[PDB]
A paper describes a structure:
MICAL is a multi-domain enzyme that is highly conserved across most animal kingdoms and participates in actin cytoskeletal reorganization. MICALs oxidize two conserved methionine residues of actin to methionine-R-sulfoxide in a stereospecific manner in the presence of NADPH, thus leading to the disassembly of F-actin into actin monomers. Here, the first crystal structure of human [name], which contains the flavin-containing monooxygenase (FMO) and calponin-homology (CH) domains, is reported.
Author numbering: 10 to 192, 197 to 269, 271 to 491, 520 to 627
Write the structure that this text describes.
Amino acid sequence: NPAHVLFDRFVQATTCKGTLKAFQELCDHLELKPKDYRSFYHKLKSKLNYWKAKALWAKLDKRGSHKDYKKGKACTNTKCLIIGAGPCGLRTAIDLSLLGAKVVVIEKRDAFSRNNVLHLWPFTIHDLRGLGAKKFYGKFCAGAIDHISIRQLQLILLKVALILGIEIHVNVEFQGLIQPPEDRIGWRALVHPKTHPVSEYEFEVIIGGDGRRNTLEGFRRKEFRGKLAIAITANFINRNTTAEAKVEEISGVAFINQKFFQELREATGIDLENIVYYKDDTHYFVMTAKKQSLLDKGVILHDYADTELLLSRENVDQEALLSYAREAADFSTQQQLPSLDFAINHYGQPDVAMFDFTCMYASENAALVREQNGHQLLVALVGDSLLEPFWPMGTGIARGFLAAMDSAWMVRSWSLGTSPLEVLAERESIYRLLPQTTPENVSKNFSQYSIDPVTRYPNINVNFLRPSQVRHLYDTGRSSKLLGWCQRQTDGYAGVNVTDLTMSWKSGLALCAIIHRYRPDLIDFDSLDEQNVEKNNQLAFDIAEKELGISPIMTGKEMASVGEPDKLSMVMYLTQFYEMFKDSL
Ligand SMILES: Cc1cc2nc3c(=O)[nH]c(=O)nc-3n(C[C@H](O)[C@H](O)[C@H](O)COP(=O)(O)OP(=O)(O)OC[C@H]3O[C@@H](n4cnc5c(N)ncnc54)[C@H](O)[C@@H]3O)c2cc1C
């Protein structure tokens, strides 16, 4: 069965682009429209009768049947935008999908490239298994493995997300919010490129899952400055031989082995406070190295006053850095690994990297609400943008996923009509615990974990803060859409300037430009003479009729002499181009 082959190719895809393409090919073959999100998942599992697929349906159905989701109707009418397809953005997206919301994720990259390896708490392993992780990554947490690379976690969550009808757009950089206009269009996003279909999306919830670079306004950062702290990560090719399998992991609770560090410093000049080894798709090491040792070995060329000069690509000898990392890895595993060949990163270089942990950040607040021109927008942070992890402690995914579930619960309460201040008060009451969570003070009964915070935080007081304590987090300060669409799509075209839906169309160049924007094979826009008003109009009209099936409302000569085109007719005509092409860039 060809649909089975397409499903297999989707499941087995090894890149973000390859996953998106296999999924689109599966949907086309099955004649399914993911953008009709309220029915997509049910139609897909009805149409695809494949034993492999049915195994996955049972897991997702079981997850979605929890009473917290209200059978998928708690958020049926809520539109959410997620910034970032990292693990925490995608995990949030997935729970928002199970509540019935429409969800769109925009991601500025188009590849999952990070090889570094993430520690997983037991509850997260159980969460991921329950989402079908093993059907996308057969080796997932095999035996006593409790880690996974960043990019493999991204691939699993991407696949789950696509199955549920979540929309994922790569090569889209979020730049800002666009307030609603006056007098009905809601909140929108400024994205690059602004011609992207997602510029049409109006949403009531936006989630910042874009790590440190996140620049949603209204989230003041708390700074935690400590002693100079430098971490080095490294990945080596893992050929899964028997020699390689025998080498024992180094857990990262193991450093509390200080004699080893003294021996290592005296034998090699490498002075570490901690080193971690995970045996995963790569042999992954992370270590924290003292500044003086890195100068002594030539990794850092000059000792600058403070760090961002100290750790600049100009002040760091890459070959010495590679040597230092390999040497530390080899000694820490006692030269039992046959070979230490660097895996190759995004840029085609050996995969070593250095990071500054001297200052870490966390948002004062997880959420806020914006209201303008009658439209309310729930804004919240999740993941590294909310609370930065110190990798050796293994809290990144655990607290990202707690906050993902907390955010889902917040959006559930929003959609059910809870007043904004009570939504915020509850969210902030939950958020106050996040930097105290450990595998032992968080709930133990994984089989009953749900987005309901009571299932995850024993004895939580969700009314710790009063609504009056979060007043400062509520901030009060012609199809116009069609017009805005034509403006963005025609921007940059010589001779065109769309300021209305009548006068700006008499020359014919604007519509020729709309056609060229989406079907450059049908028209040479550059060859056109702006003075040939009748010829250019009629060319646009004929192409649209013959190639696009849009019936003309007038002739070129009628347009060339009209004075002002009827606007009801202009709008009926232009809207057909809008509907044909708006989702289609
Ligand atoms: C280079 C690097 C190495 C790391 N190494 C380790 C490690 O060894 N061990 C460890 O435990 N943790 C490590 N981490 C942290 C770990 O990746 C995160 O804790 C984890 O992935 C969860 O973070 P997140 O999903 O919130 O954000 P991230 O994983 O940072 O994902 C953010 C996503 O948002 C996208 N994005 C950013 N800005 C925009 C925008 N304007 N528009 C659209 N998309 C945008 C980014 O491309 C990215 O895909 C590393 C992080 C980085 C950046």
